[PDB]
Design a protein around this ligand. Structure first.
Ligand SMILES: CCCCCCCCCCCCCCCCCC(=O)OC[C@H](COP(=O)(O)OCCN)OC(=O)CCCCCCCCCCCCCCCCC
Ligand SMILES: CCCCCCCCCCCCCCCCCC(=O)OC[C@H](COP(=O)(O)OCCN)OC(=O)CCCCCCCCCCCCCCCCC
Ligand SMILES: CCCCCCCCCCCCCCCCCC(=O)OC[C@H](COP(=O)(O)OCCN)OC(=O)CCCCCCCCCCCCCCCCC
Ligand SMILES: CCCCCCCCCCCCCCCCCC(=O)OC[C@H](COP(=O)(O)OCCN)OC(=O)CCCCCCCCCCCCCCCCC
Ligand SMILES: CCCCCCCCCCC1=C(C)C(=O)C(OC)=C(OC)C1=O
Ligand SMILES: CCCCCCCCCCCCCCCCCCCC
Ligand SMILES: CCCCCCCCCCCCCCCCCCCC
Ligand code: SF4
Lengths: 213, 131, 149, 60, 322, 162
């Protein structure tokens, strides 16, 4: 229940992303597993987002940074202006066709490990902008770890996606060093949130009427 | 004595352990974790688009005159550093000497300010046009 | 409500403080909105009111027909050209609409103020420091959705 | 700059430091998602559902 | 090896090692403390989830920083690029090595003292200069030029701001400086020296409002853009150690050091140093950033004549009362 | 004391030799920093504590100005390195090499015949230097202020734009 990705920027593959993915089994012993868990804990509790925004979704993400939401509580407020110091790229906005090589370049300039959250309907699929100048989803060329529906997602939806990314990071397998060992990145194939929440969602019967505050 | 040589050894061990701790953290950062590979990874960051030229250029600073003046004024500062540790021994005569020295220093500073030697702001950034 | 005006110089500081006074004036307008709120309909009685009032849609057949056609094929606007200019948050925003008689706009032209302000940028900042340009960008009050539409 | 401008600027810096330091004694404005749930008004536009009539059949 | 001299030597060595470890730990835990105190000043919490009260946030950040890819760019001068974080880490640590934190607790009781601090600050500028130049980045080169401009602004009067305290103590030694404040702390007679040293010492660490080499709004973090992993962490750990050192020097020179009526001397020293660390955080939270030409004008036209006139008045007072 | 003197002097000699035969200007400035730090360590080993402190203090600022000027003019990538490396040839250095060597030989021969009781390294304090500086050397202080004033005026008149 793991997908292994191996990157190959100079291989015989031109289409982005320059990577290959294969469904494998969990590679994980009594000490390497514990130290991998410690590295995953440290990485998931210190996620520095890239100060990068395309449209209105960025306004909601930085709203989550402020005092009324305080995403600092999760340890994810540091907000680096440099791609080298950033761990998380939030595609917060429309992937405009003119902006797509820029997004690819900025993703290339980030360093390992890196995660991608596609925030909002535009970044997810193109959203309402099925139009000549808009790429229909940033996952046409960027591998995406978490998708947030919404236009915009509210700041707590961005926080919920941050927690989802934390659970995905906490059970991933990455090279502990670049000198010795397997260097491919193993990501757990999680149960979908739709299937997880289906039981409590279908059981809803009555909601408040839209007539009061 | 003994406290002096103890403090000398303490200073030596302080410097050695500080430099060794810095080197150890650099080595641990270098060897731990994976590495990223990308086509444009080894391109300098300029907000996502290629550079025009590079950072290796004749970039003209505007405060170079102030840099010369800073070197001069730092030497004047060391003269005052020598005076300030022995003010009671030099007496009022040393005070008169340092007053003349400081007055010549301040007259040179006033001269530099008044001739515009310390001004390098462009004319559109001098903030003359206000309500 | 008052319209705050500057002394003759459009500064970064003057633009920001003018927007502060505009915020206070909008607070005055909101106080008047809270105190004197008319009782009446939230939708016009016109046949082209899209969609019609929902309760009448849910129980009256002709209203249901109007709703059905308005949300599916669309409301039919007779062929004309229309224009509306408003004071938006960042300047003057306008819509220029051409109907050809269909349920879709033949032409929708949106004039936005941020386009003009960003074009003004090189004339007003030429010969300044970079920090002045940072402050200028902060004081223009623009977003790029407004600029590029 | 003038002497009055220097003194006034010193006073304004002191005032800014003082007011932020007094914000250190204020009540927190944070709504602590996810420990306290987000309040949403009843007509908030989030996840879409299909509903049933009072007889239990699907309304669609 | 049973002799009083040798065991006194190892006791002094152990005390110096303890001082070094506590200062480095205080720099890292004050990165965490800056986050929590900024949350406090901005009506929020800051990191309070990872561990009890966020106490394990520093550990998580350290693990992330260690296992981040610590890279050296192919377009950079590799040796200078690696050397600049080492200078940024070590210079103001060595400047701390003259701070007497308690009677009997000082690493180096140097005869030069505050001269050694000036030596280390003058060496400390080269970290930002080398980081800006070696990284071959345009924003980083602009940050390096801004850092040199800042050094021109403050270094002309930093030592002169300390010279009134030096004149009152009659010595460069820092224990003599805290002994001269047995009755009145130097913040009362050397008040103008105090404010000029506060300005220049904030400018020493390139801390806000003098963070022009790393100005995020202008230079997109400037001189350390190409740094990542533990070299970036080295730059910020050195910055926080510099905050600790400048606060402790301010306490030592202007606030009596460890002298106080009731508490143990280290408690007084730690309380005053913690207060000025909090003041570093608060001025980062409170006041805006001036233009760097305005900072140069302020340093050369206001602060330097103030330090010169302060030294003259201090000497006249000393000789009048002698 | 002698350990520090000999090692700091060796480091200063090697770093200065690296300075005068280097192509990269920023690297040359770094080796100049290292050589001046080593000469300051030599000063500290001889008891001249004030001189060593001032050696680090005023050359850290001075080489910073040299870095400013090097960034303004010299640094261009490999163009100035190629131009400077082509300016250095075996003949160009071997010419003045024996000249400097025989000057050093004559100066060293004159040095070795002097009466030497050894430098005990007793520290001469900054207070004593300040007492001498504002005592017997008052006119030196005031005319040095005039000298630095002349340097200021010359730098302003020459190093301008228009
Ligand atoms: C242990 C170490 C840490 C200690 C922590 C506590 C102390 C922190 C000290 C922080 C220092 C901040 C200093 C900032 C100086 C900025 C000066 C400057 O450049 O101001 C520019 C501004 C306008 O510039 P102008 O020259 O008028 O315009 C020319 C335009 N081309 O000019 C003006 O606005 C004019 C007024 C300038 C005012 C300068 C600041 C006054 C001193 C600092 C604030 C007070 C701090 C507390 C002091 C003690 C209080 C008891
Ligand atoms: C602790 C000691 C604090 C001493 C200063 C208290 C300042 C109080 C304050 O908040 O002053 C703000 C005020 C702003 O002035 P303004 O915007 O014109 O508004 C007038 C109506 N308040 O500012 C003023 O009105 C300016 C008057 C205060 C000037 C204080 C001068 C202190 C001594 C000199 C320090 C400067 C040294 C510079 C180097
Ligand atoms: C590798 C380093 C090994 C250790 C170096 C020696 C440390 C101790 C030392 O420098 O002692 C010499 C001197 C002592 O001075 P003091 O104690 O005041 O006086 C005793 C008698 N009067 O103290 C001094 O001379 C102090 C000034 C020199 C300290 C230089 C430290 C390194 C600076 C550059 C870092 C880059
Ligand atoms: C290679 C790394 C650098 C090595 C050179 C610098 C350190 C040399 C070793 C010093 C060890 C301590 C020592 O020898 O101290 C003796 C003396 C202390 O003074 P004193 O009180 O006379 O001591 C004798 C007892 N009465 O010490 C002194 O007087 C001099 C103190 C050491 C010199 C100052 C620091 C020089 C830094 C050089 C940096 C070079 C570039 C990097
Ligand atoms: C022993 C090694 C420990 C390394 C820990 C490094 C932690 C660095 C955090 C500093 C910091 C950064 C970079 C930062 O960018 C930032 O935002 C302005 C802060 O305040 C919220 C910070 O506190
Ligand atoms: C925020 C304060 C930072 C202080 C940094 C320097 C501290 C170095 C470690 C000192 C440890 C010993 C303290 C004195 C011991 C004797 C007194 C004990 C009772 C207080
Ligand atoms: C283009 C002009 C270049 C001028 C370079 C000048 C170099 C001069 C080198 C002189 C070397 C002298 C070596 C010793 C000679 C014998 C002793 C002196 C004469 C008796
Ligand atoms: S998804 Fe909606 S809110 Fe987000 S960028 Fe697109 S239009 Fe803006």
């Amino acid at each position: 229940d793991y997908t292994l990705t191996r990157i190959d920027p100079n291989g015989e593959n031109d289409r982005y992303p320059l990577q290959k993915q294969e469904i494998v089994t969990d590679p994980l012993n009594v000490f390497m597993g514990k130290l991998n868990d410690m590295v995953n804990w440290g990485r998931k509790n210190s996620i520095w987002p890239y100060n990068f925004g395309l449209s209105c979704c960025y306004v909601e993400m930085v709203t989550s940074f402020t005092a009324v939401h305080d995403v600092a509580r999760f340890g994810a407020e540091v907000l680096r202006a440099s791609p080298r110091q950033a761990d998380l790229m939030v595609v917060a906005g429309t992937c405009f066709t003119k902006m797509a090589p820029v997004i690819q370049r900025l993703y290339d300039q980030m360093l390992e490990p890196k995660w991608v959250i596609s925030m909002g309907a535009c970044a997810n699929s193109g959203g309402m902008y099925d139009i000549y100048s808009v790429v229909q989803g940033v996952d046409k060329f960027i591998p995406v770890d978490v998708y947030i529906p919404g236009c915009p997602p509210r700041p707590e939806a961005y926080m919920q996606a941050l927690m989802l990314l934390q659970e995905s990071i906490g059970k991933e397998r990455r090279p502990l060093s670049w000198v010795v060992g397997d260097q491919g990145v193993y990501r757990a194939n999680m149960q979908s949130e739709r299937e997880r929440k289906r039981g409590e969602r279908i059981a809803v019967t009555n909601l408040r009427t839209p007539d009061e505050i | 004595s003994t406290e002096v040589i103890a403090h000398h050894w303490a200073f030596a061990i302080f410097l050695i352990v500080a430099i060794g701790l810095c080197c150890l953290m650099l080595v641990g950062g270098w060897f731990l974790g994976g590495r990223a590979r990308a086509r444009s990874k080894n391109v300098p960051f300029e907000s996502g688009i290629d550079s025009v030229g590079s950072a290796r250029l004749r970039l003209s600073a505007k405060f170079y005159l102030v840099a010369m003046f800073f070197v001069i004024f730092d030497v004047e500062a060391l003269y005052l550093f020598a005076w300030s540790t022995s003010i009671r021994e030099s007496g009022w005569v040393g005070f008169v000497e340092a007053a003349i020295f400081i007055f010549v220093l301040l007259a040179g500073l006033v001269y530099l300010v008044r001739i515009g030697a310390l001004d390098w702001t462009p004319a559109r950034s001098r903030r003359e046009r206000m309500n | 409500f008052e319209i705050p005006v500057g002394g003759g110089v459009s500064d970064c500081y003057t633009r920001v403080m003018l927007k502060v006074e505009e915020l206070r004036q909008s607070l005055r307008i909101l106080e008047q909105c809270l105190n004197n709120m008319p009782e009446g309909p939230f939708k016009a009685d016109h046949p082209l009111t899209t969609p019609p009032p929902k309760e009448r849609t849910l129980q009256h057949i002709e209203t249901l027909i109007t709703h059905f056609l308005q949300v599916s094929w669309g409301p039919v606007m007779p062929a004309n050209e229309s224009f509306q200019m408003i004071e938006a948050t960042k300047g003057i925003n306008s819509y220029y609409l051409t109907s050809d008689g269909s349920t879709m706009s033949y032409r929708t032209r949106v004039r936005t103020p941020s386009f003009a302000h960003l074009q003004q940028i090189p004339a007003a900042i030429r010969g300044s420091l970079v920090s002045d340009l940072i402050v200028y960008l902060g004081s223009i009050d623009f977003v790029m959705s407004d600029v590029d539409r | 700059m003038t002497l009055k401008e220097l003194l006034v600027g010193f006073g304004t810096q002191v005032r800014s430091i003082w007011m932020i330091g007094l914000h250190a004694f204020a009540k927190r404005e944070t709504r602590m998602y996810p420990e306290e749930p987000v309040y949403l008004p009843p007509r908030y536009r989030g996840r879409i559902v299909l509903t049933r009539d009072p007889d239990g059949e699907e309304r669609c | 090896w049973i002799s009083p001299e040798l065991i006194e030597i190892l006791l002094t060595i152990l005390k110096a090692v303890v001082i070094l470890l506590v200062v480095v730990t205080c720099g890292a835990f004050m990165s965490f403390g800056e986050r929590r105190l900024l949350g406090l000043f901005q009506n929020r919490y800051g990191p309070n989830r990872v561990g009890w009260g966020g106490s394990l946030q520093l550990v998580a950040d350290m693990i992330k920083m260690f296992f981040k890819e610590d890279w050296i760019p192919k377009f950079s001068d590799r040796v200078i690029f690696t050397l600049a974080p080492m200078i940024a880490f070590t210079s103001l640590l060595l400047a701390f090595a003259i701070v007497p934190v308690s009677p009997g607790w000082v690493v180096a009781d140097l005869n030069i003292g505050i001269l050694f601090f000036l030596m280390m600050a003058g060496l400390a500028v080269y970290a930002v200069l080398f980081a800006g130049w070696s990284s071959n980045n345009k924003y980083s080169l602009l940050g390096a030029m801004r850092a040199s401009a800042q050094t021109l602004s403050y270094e002309v009067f930093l030592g002169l701001s300390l010279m009134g305290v030096v004149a009152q103590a009659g010595s460069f030694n820092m224990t003599d400086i805290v002994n001269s404040q047995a009755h009145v702390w130097n913040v009362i007679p050397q008040f103008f020296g105090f404010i000029t040293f506060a300005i220049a010492g904030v400018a020493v660490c390139h801390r806000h409002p003098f963070d022009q080499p790393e100005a995020e709004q202008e230079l997109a973090d400037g001189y350390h853009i190409e740094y990542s992993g533990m070299k970036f962490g080295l730059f910020f750990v050195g910055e926080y150690i510099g905050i600790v050192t400048i606060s402790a020097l301010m306490v030592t020179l202007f606030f009596g050091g460890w002298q106080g009526p009731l508490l143990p001397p280290f408690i007084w020293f730690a309380l005053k140093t913690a207060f000025f660390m909090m003041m570093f955080i608060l001025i980062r939270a409170s006041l805006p950033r001036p233009r760097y030409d305005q900072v140069m004008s302020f340093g050369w036209k206001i602060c330097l004549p103030l330090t010169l006139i302060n030294l003259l008045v201090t000497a006249a007072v000393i000789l009048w009362q002698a | 004391m002698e350990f520090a003197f000999y090692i700091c002097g060796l480091i200063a000699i090697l770093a200065t030799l690296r300075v005068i035969t280097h192509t990269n200007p920023v690297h040359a400035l770094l080796y100049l920093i290292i050589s001046l730090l080593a000469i300051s360590g030599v000063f500290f080993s001889l008891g001249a504590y004030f001189a060593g402190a001032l050696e680090i203090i005023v050359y850290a600022g001075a080489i910073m100005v040299l870095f400013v000027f090097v960034v303004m003019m010299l640094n261009l990538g490999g163009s100035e390195i190629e131009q400077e490396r082509q300016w250095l040839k075996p003949q160009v250095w071997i010419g003045p090499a024996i000249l400097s060597a025989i000057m050093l030989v004559v100066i060293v021969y004159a040095i070795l015949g002097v009466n030497d009781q050894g430098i005990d390294g007793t520290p001469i304090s900054a207070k004593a230097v300040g007492i001498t500086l504002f005592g017997p050397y008052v006119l030196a202080v005031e005319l040095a202020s005039m000298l630095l004033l002349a340097g200021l005026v010359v730098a302003f008149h020459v190093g301008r734009e228009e």
